[PDB]
Amino acid sequence: AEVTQLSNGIVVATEHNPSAHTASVGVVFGSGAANENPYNNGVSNLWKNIFLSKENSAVAAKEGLALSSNISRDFQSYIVSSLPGSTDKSLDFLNQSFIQQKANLLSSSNFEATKKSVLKQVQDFEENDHPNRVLEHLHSTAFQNTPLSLPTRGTLESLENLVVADLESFANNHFLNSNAVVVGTGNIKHEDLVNSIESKNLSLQTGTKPVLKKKAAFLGSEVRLRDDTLPKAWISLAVEGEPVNSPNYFVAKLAAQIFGSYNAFEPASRLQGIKLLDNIQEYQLCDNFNHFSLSYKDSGLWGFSTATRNVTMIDDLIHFTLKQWNRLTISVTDTEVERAKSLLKLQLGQLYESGNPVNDANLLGAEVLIKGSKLSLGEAFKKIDAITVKDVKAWAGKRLWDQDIAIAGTGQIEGLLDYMRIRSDMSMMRW
Amino acid sequence: MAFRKSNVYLSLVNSYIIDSPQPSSINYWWNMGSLLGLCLVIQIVTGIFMAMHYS
Amino acid sequence: MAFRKSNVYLSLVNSYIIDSPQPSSINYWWNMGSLLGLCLVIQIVTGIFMAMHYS
Amino acid sequence: PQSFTSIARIGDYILKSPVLSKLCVPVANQFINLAGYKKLGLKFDDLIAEENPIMQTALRRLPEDESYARAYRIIRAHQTELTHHLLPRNEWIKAQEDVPYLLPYILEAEAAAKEKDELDNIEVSK
Amino acid sequence: LTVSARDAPTKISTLAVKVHGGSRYATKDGVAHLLNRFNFQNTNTRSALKLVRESELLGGTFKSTLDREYITLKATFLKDDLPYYVNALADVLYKTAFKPHELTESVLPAARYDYAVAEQCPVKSAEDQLYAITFRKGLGNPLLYDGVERVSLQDIKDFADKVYTKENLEVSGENVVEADLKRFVDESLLSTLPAGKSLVSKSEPKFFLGEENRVRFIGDSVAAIGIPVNKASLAQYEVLANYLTSALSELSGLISSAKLDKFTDGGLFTLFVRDQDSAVVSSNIKKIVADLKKGKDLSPAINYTKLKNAVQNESVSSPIELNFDAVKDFKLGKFNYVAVGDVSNLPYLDEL
Amino acid sequence: LTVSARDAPTKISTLAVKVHGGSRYATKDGVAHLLNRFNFQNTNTRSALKLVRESELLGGTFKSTLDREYITLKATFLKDDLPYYVNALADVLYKTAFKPHELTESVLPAARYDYAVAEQCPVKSAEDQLYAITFRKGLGNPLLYDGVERVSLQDIKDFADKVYTKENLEVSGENVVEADLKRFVDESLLSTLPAGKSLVSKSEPKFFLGEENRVRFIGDSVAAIGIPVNKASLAQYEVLANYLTSALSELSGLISSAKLDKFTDGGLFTLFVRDQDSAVVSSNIKKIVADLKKGKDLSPAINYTKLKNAVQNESVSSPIELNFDAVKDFKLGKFNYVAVGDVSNLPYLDEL
Numbered sequence A: 001a002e003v004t005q006l007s008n009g010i011v012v013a014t015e016h017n018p019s020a021h022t023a024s025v026g027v028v029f030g031s032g033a034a035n036e037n038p039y040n041n042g043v044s045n046l047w048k049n050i051f052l053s054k055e056n057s058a059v060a061a062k063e064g065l066a067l068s069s070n071i072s073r074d075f076q077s078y079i080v081s082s083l084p085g086s087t088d089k090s091l092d093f094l095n096q097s098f099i100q101q102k103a104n105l106l107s108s109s110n111f112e113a114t115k116k117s118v119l120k121q122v123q124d125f126e127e128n129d130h131p132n133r134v135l136e137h138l139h140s141t142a143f144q145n146t147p148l149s150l151p152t153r154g155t156l157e158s159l160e161n162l163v164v165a166d167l168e169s170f171a172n173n174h175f176l177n178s179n180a181v182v183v184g185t186g187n188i189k190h191e192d193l194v195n196s197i198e199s200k201n202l203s204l205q206t207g208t209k210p211v212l213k214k215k216a217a218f219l220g221s222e223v224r225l226r227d228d229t230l231p232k233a234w235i236s237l238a239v240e241g242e243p244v245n246s247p248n249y250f251v252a253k254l255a256a257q258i259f260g261s262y263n264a265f266e267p268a269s270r271l272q273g274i275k276l277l278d279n280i281q282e283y284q285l286c287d288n289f290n291h292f293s294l295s296y297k298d299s300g301l302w303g304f305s306t307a308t309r310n311v312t313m314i315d316d317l318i319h320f321t322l323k324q325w326n327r328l329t330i331s332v333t334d335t336e337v338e339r340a341k342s343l344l345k346l347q348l349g350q351l352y353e354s355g356n357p358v359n360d361a362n363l364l365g366a367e368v369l370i371k372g373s374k375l376s377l378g379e380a381f382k383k384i385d386a387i388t389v390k391d392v393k394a395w396a397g398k399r400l401w402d403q404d405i406a407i408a409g410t411g412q413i414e415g416l417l418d419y420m421r422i423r424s425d426m427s428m429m430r431w
Numbered sequence B, C: 001m002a003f004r005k006s007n008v009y010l011s012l013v014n015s016y017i018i019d020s021p022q023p024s025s026i027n028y029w030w031n032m033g034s035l036l037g038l039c040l041v042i043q044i045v046t047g048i049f050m051a052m053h054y055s
Numbered sequence D: 001p002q003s004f005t006s007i008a009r010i011g012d013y014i015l016k017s018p019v020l021s022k023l024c025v026p027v028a029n030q031f032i033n034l035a036g037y038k039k040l041g042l043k044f045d046d047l048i049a050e051e052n053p054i055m056q057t058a059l060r061r062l063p064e065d066e067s068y069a070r071a072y073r074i075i076r077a078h079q080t081e082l083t084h085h086l087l088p089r090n091e092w093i094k095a096q097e098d099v100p101y102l103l104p105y106i107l108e109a110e111a112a113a114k115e116k117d118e119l120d121n122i123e124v125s126k
Numbered sequence E, F: 001l002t003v004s005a006r007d008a009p010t011k012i013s014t015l016a017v018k019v020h021g022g023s024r025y026a027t028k029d030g031v032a033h034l035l036n037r038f039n040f041q042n043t044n045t046r047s048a049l050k051l052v053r054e055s056e057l058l059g060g061t062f063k064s065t066l067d068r069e070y071i072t073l074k075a076t077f078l079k080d081d082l083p084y085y086v087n088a089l090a091d092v093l094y095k096t097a098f099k100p101h102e103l104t105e106s107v108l109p110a111a112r113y114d115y116a117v118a119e120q121c122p123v124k125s126a127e128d129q130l131y132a133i134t135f136r137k138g139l140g141n142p143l144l145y146d147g148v149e150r151v152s153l154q155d156i157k158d159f160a161d162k163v164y165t166k167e168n169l170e171v172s173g174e175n176v177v178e179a180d181l182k183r184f185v186d187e188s189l190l191s192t193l194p195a196g197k198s199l200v201s202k203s204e205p206k207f208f209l210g211e212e213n214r215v216r217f218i219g220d221s222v223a224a225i226g227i228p229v230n231k232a233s234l235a236q237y238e239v240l241a242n243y244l245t246s247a248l249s250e251l252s253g254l255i256s257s258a259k260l261d262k263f264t265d266g267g268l269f270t271l272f273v274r275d276q277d278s279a280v281v282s283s284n285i286k287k288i289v290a291d292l293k294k295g296k297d298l299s300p301a302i303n304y305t306k307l308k309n310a311v312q313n314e315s316v317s318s319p320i321e322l323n324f325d326a327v328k329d330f331k332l333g334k335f336n337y338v339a340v341g342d343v344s345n346l347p348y349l350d351e352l
């Protein structure tokens, strides 16, 4: 299905899908925002946004190419998608303006306009988008003083000290042949992509990226960005979870799928088979929740996020969901595991098997970059079907039962109790 | 809601000794009230066990 | 608000014996409880005034 | 504490029998007449204890005019019992007027809650 | 009963029953919205809780979406569970219970939430004002129920058996075997549905030009222009919508958004300019109309919008099959205009 | 500083200071409403509590009214208490404190209450829509502050500095000696206000015809028409406004209300049809304009008009003094139209 080969310096990965009507090539590097200082934080955002400038994207639009890019913790990608007959126009564009001739992109009077719009973008992020900024603050307090603690968008105080020297320094240090996968999704075939990446003699750079002196360590902590002038209360709360290439990767995904997501205002979201709903529905404790299992290279996160307007009963919402977490160690049933198996297979099928080949390019690039190949969906389903109740109980006794947590909150979180009551909720006194 | 709030008596116990919001800055001179309550329990129990033998 | 509501102790007294909403249909068998309260006060007071002379 | 599906099950088995109905329904009619709730202007579905979630949903799903009539019959029974009298015999409930009006709502809410707990204790065959 | 499918060697199937029952066909205001929010409540043979808690164990979810033309009943599931989901959607279309306690507990609060979440966005306000002043009683119906004319439960039942007829629906399946889907849509309850009339009209929807509307609003202010498009000049306006938002145009930093809603009998081209202060919105919308009243060469954006049309026809599979090659020039003629927000400082149609 | 007074042998006097500072001259939307609600708050020398207590012990009341053209400061009192009320009005105009804690505690909730009770009447909603589509940014400014554009306290102080000038006010007393009033409005603080300029224009207010606006509303439905009137045709539209709501007409079973607002430089004739269902008000307004487009003779209603004009200009003794004798016929020309309520069942302007 996926095929992956290694050229003179570049690894190439394709997912050919002959019933698609767009093809999409690009390059996925292996250094997201986890490879920055607290002082050049926001360099990858500036590279994402100078790759998508108006004068860089006008050249792609005249040839019928649509640009896309993504900054994450581990990886970063730069994707050019077009019609199936014009894959080499895309490879030519990605070469001649991003890979080799990046001196017109890094023009001053282009850098200034892009830096100004990125500053405006993160300023409107930091004061209007409340669930995502507390997920970023959960990351920045769970992994503090380690490289995984950095926001992917950067920081308004960090971003206004950046110059073009920092962008080209990061480019020299990280945009390398040893760090990059060239991806192709859509109905581009593999032999045509390798034949046109050896037809042009495409070479990115020849160094090797710096290796970080400390690994990401989970520190049980809290942060409270309280603001009484906001309507709701947004609370994210997580334990240390599994990183990628765990053996407990799918067990963590399944254990997050057991408690699922919920929306108070959708009538078929109130009828789910979660036993948390018939504790939080009687007094309408929350508006929504979602249980996540975020996996990175070094470490991971496992927890939930809620937004609620019932600011008087936040502590009972937290108490009821953590007493529902305890059942994974003690008394999780057969049925909850089977239901979460079916829902997890559906969620992974909707994530991978989707029509958009930009998303397939991002997923294939990050997966092949971190473990050298890509696990198929049939093998993923055969690894999900093999999970038992004892695997969930063993994983929850390891990672959940009586462990330190990380909390982040904004809004009206006066009703949220301190660290120690919430942490003492993580293990019940066997009743 | 939690059973320590939903109950008649346990909400009194909760509201007075469990969830009761205290100022964080209070020092060890604010333990004298709990100390006087312990003293009163000591006096009452030992007084009953001596009045079982006092004439 | 009224002083019988805006107090600490008179709030309890008001809520239990003054503004307590009773069903209007209750017959004379719903006086046994206040009768047991009167009986308990009788027993406690007369017992104290006899324990002042009991050996 | 005996939920109405059980009562309706036993009652339908009695009423659908030729022998059991002709012996038991006269006894039940005399029981209803001796019970004397009708003399206070009450139908039997005003008598059911309402402080459980099943009857709270049934009373919430009852329509507006039925709820106003039920509230009036209840307030009239309280004022009548307050004076230790009865209602005048023209104001008594007749047998055709003593209709089961809350019973479909109670039966629907009870079937909903029974399906709810049977699907909470669901178990798969794998 | 047009049944069409499209196989794939993959894991997730997706069924959809699309009914010509949108706002354009609504009898009273918001009956399509209330029937849409009613869709997956309980049937006569299976409760709404039993449907959710069996679909979770079989591995799939149900959804139903409303727009101007369609009520779409979508079922996303694991590939070899198809007859369960065709019987689920057939039961939803044929026998749904229509209880007044369901109207007053689930459907009306869900619809009230939908209206209150769409009310805060001034672009949705401007878009429905634009639709209502362009088309008056067909497509210009209100999209969501807001209780200005009271919709009963009998109105919802009447709309349901008006639009849930055998000639007024399509069945479309991604990643479904077409022979087995056709065998499962008969031997079902889609064969017992009434063979009613197809509500789609092949006429032209009788547009109006030069109209203007101004709405007071607290927050962001939006200036919107709207142009009705016939079936012939549909692709010229699609090239224009993809040209104005791409980096080819100098107006892309002034335009908040621009799109072309397409139908089977034409469409509407809408353009929105939105921010938080009226001076910038007034300046920008004057620049947009002063540049569009002169010509725009749209021929650079043809391959770009060929790609964009392929992208947006991957998600849907409603193909309109547009030319894109005979598109050379655009010049703005007459247009309807909506000012939402601080309308004492937004310009009028005189000044544009 | 025009000072006029009309004596009487009567116990109760009243005294009005009228400034040209109403919603016609509002620099921001609703700064006149906030200045009006601000008027009798505390001044530098006397608190607002002390004014109310001392005036009650002396026996009178103050009031401040806002209409489109004026801000009126009225004081009703017992007759021989005149210089107290003169100095109180002079202090209110000259030296009001303009404290932020008075803006946020007593003035803004009062204005919020005013707007919240004026929203509930669909006739006032239709009337301001009518004013806004006939005159755009003159008299079409909104009467009441609704917070669509934010009015700070410095805006209220600037508007008061603009309109509380010596050339922009009229002192108008009833049951009061004119020599005493003229002695008390100098010997005062009204004679050391800034001698600015009078904001009233002698031009024509630049009307607009053929416009239409529809706003949805939950409740009663109102269809309204509105005709701008110049200065010389004022008497004819007043005879029409009194003819259409009297028993001489066939239409007052259908017409809910009809009036003519008269200003210095023209006016606006408004007509309102209001009901709880849309079919009645639709057929009514169709009948009204269909039989007003054919002519009407108004010479029956001239004496009735003289009577109603006398009883409605008995109150204020600055009226307009129309002639009424040369009016014979009326035929409806062009007019602006406003639908409020169930707007997808009310008729449009081209259907009238």
Ligand code: HEM
Pocket (backbone or CB within 6 Å): B040, B043, B044, B045, B046, B047, B048, B049, B050, B051, B054
């Ligand atoms: C308020 C709390 C109490 C205080 C402060 C208190 C104080 C005292 C004191 C000072 C003594 C004298 C002890 C001595 O000097 O030898 C005493 C004696 C006594 N108290 Fe209390 N007491 C209290 C509560 C009680 C109670 C509740 C009882 C009975 C149940 C009780 C029963 C006795 C008895 C029987 C004695 C007898 C003499 C002795 O054994 O010391 N006390 N009390």
Ligand code: HEM
Pocket (backbone or CB within 6 Å): C040, C043, C044, C046, C047, C048, C049, C050, C051, C054
């Ligand atoms: C709950 C309420 C009470 C009840 C039911 C109760 C019951 C009794 C009874 C039945 C007797 C025996 C009477 C006899 O046959 O002579 C008695 C005796 C006695 N009770 Fe109580 N009693 C109560 C409260 C009290 C209290 C609070 C005291 C102490 C203050 C007290 C002090 C006595 C004494 C001293 C006697 C001694 C014998 C006598 O004098 O009759 N009682 N009690």
